Amino acid sequence: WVPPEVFDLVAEDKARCMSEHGTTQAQIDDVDKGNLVNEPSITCYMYCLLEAFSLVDDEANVDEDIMLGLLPDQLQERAQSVMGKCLPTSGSDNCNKIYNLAKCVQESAPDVWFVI
Amino acid sequence: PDWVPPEVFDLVAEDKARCMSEHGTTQAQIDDVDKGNLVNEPSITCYMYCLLEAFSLVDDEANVDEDIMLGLLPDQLQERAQSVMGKCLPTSGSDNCNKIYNLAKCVQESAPDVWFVI
Ligand SMILES: CC(=O)CCCCC/C=C/C(=O)O
Ligand SMILES: CC(=O)CCCCC/C=C/C(=O)O
Ligand SMILES: CC(=O)CCCCC/C=C/C(=O)O
Ligand SMILES: [Cl-]
Ligand SMILES: [Cl-]
Ligand SMILES: [Cl-]
Ligand SMILES: [Cl-]
Ligand SMILES: [Mg+2]
Numbered sequence: 583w584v585p586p587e588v589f590d591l592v593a594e595d596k597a598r599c600m601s602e603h604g605t606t607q608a609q610i611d612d613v614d615k616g617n618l619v620n621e622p623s624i625t626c627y628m629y630c631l632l633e634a635f636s637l638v639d640d641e642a643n644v645d646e647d648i649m650l651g652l653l654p655d656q657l658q659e660r661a662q663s664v665m666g667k668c669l670p671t672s673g674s675d676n677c678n679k680i681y682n683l684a685k686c687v688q689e690s691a692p693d694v695w696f697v698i
Numbered sequence: 699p700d701w702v703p704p705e706v707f708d709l710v711a712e713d714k715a716r717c718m719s720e721h722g723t724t725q726a727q728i729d730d731v732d733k734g735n736l737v738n739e740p741s742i743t744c745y746m747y748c749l750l751e752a753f754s755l756v757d758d759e760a761n762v763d764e765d766i767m768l769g770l771l772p773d774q775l776q777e778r779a780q781s782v783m784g785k786c787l788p789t790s791g792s793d794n795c796n797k798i799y800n801l802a803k804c805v806q807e808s809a810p811d812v813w814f815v816i
Contacts, residue, residue, distance in 0.1 A: 586734045586806070586813035592710055594772040616704045635753065636766045648766075651754040652709060654716060688704070695704035 592698060599630035616695040618684050625677035628684060631698060642671050642679035652696075664690045709752070710816055717748035734813035736802055743795040746802065749816050760789050760797040775812065782808045 596610065605627040613624060632638045637649050646665055653661050668686035673679035688695065718728060723745040736742055750756040755767050764783050771779045786804035791797035806813070 584811065586809075586811050588733065589772060589775070589812070589814045591770045591772075591814050591816055595770055598772065614706065616701075616706065634769050636763075636769055648754050652752065654712075689699075692699065692702055693704055695706045696709055697706060698709055 595631060595634045595698075599627050599634065602630055603627045613684075614697050616688060618681065618688060620678065620681045622677050625681040625684075629676045629680040632680060635698065638671075638676075638680070640676075642673075642676040642683075644669050644671055644683070652698075660691070713749055713752040713816070717745050717752070721745045721748060732815050734806060736799065736806075738796060738799045740795050743799040743802075747795050747798045750798065753816060756798070758794075760791075760794045762787055762789055762801065771814075778809060778812065 599605065600607075600610065603626040604623050606623075609621075609624040610627070612619070613628065619625075629638065629642055632642075633640065635648070636645060637652075638644050644665070646669065649665070650658060650661055664687055667690050668683055671679040671683050673682045714728065717723070718725075721744040722741045724741070727742055727745070730736070731742060731746060736746075747756065747760075750762070751758065753766070753770070754763060755770075756762050762783075764787060767783065768776065768779060782805055785808055786801055789797035789801050791800040
């Protein structure tokens with residue numbers, strides 16, 4: 583009757599993305615506080631994490647329906663407005679695209695910061 | 699503008715709180731769900747539904763998106779998850795929440811040693 587091993591999917595996904603990009607816990611902790619920097623070790627992590635959740639494709643194009651689907655009904659119109667300002671993504675590579683997206687979302691809704 | 703510190707919201711934590719409130723789920727029940735101990739009662743099963751739907755793993759008609767789910771699962775479970783979803787999807791049951799109950803039970807029967815929390 584052994585209880586199942588319980589896998590924390592978010593933790594697994596972060597762990598995999600960090601290992602793939604040489605990302606430190608300190609860097610993840612920065613992003614989770616809303617502190618953004620254009621450094622591939624952390625911005626490629628952000629890209630990786632979004633891609634794992636099907637929020638972006640392999641050119642860091644946002645799937646708006648999936649991204650909006652993260653949020654409660656009450657936040658939809660606010661979120662749609664942010665996406666109107668911040669999409670489509672742009673930047674020099676997938677990591678920079680997500681840096682620029684994160685910065686746009688931060689600046690567009692400066693009093694809140696949502697993290698997976 | 700200058701940077702100002704935002705109020706930070708953890709989606710998983712906020713989803714659990716919202717889902718608990720919207721389905722009458724007790725904290726003891728949340729703990730049970732986290733450990734994989736289920737019952738076919740909506741305060742458990744609609745809560746589980748609610749958590750899946752918040753990451754687009756299910757839509758509002760009990761259709762599970764297998765491709766979205768596979769991206770979330772760790773490398774070490776990919777092969778097993780493919781097989782388990784092959785067996786257990788698409789969903790079936792008497793209503794939206796009961797479909798998710800049956801899916802959970804199918805997963806537990808197929809892979810007794812594997813459970814997850816979002
Ligand atoms: C974790 C994540 O990327 C979700 C991004 C959506 C944020 C847009 C919402 C802004 C607001 O509600 O003010
Ligand atoms: C859409 C957007 O806000 C840019 C990406 C933000 C990174 C999300 C952080 C997730 C986590 O903390 O797990
Ligand atoms: C198809 C598959 O591998 C998992 C589906 C069952 C998960 C039940 C819900 C769990 C949760 O909400 O934490
Ligand atoms: Cl885009
Ligand atoms: Cl309910
Ligand atoms: Cl299905
Ligand atoms: Cl039905
Ligand atoms: Mg939705």
